[PDB]
Write a structure and sequence with these properties.
mainly beta; Rubrerythrin, domain 2; three-stranded antiparallel β-sheet; about 0% helix; about 15% strand; globular; binds fe (iii) ion; electron transport(iron); monomeric; rubredoxin
Length: about 50
């Protein structure tokens, strides 16, 4: 349940919540996000998130 933060905009990916609108059910770890998933608030890539 390790949270990751977007270093572009500050959105925090929370595995307990997932990201339903992008096809990511609650409980999905950051490491298991789809290869094309991007920050839902700003569009930044996963390579620009850091552990938070
Ligand atoms: Fe972002």
């Amino acid at each position: 349940m390790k949270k990751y933060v977007c270093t572009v905009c500050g959105y925090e990916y929370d595995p307990a919540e997932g990201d339903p609108d992008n096809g990511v059910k609650p409980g999905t770890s950051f490491d298991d996000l789809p290869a094309d998933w991007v920050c839902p608030v700003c569009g930044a890539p996963k390579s620009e998130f850091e552990a938070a």
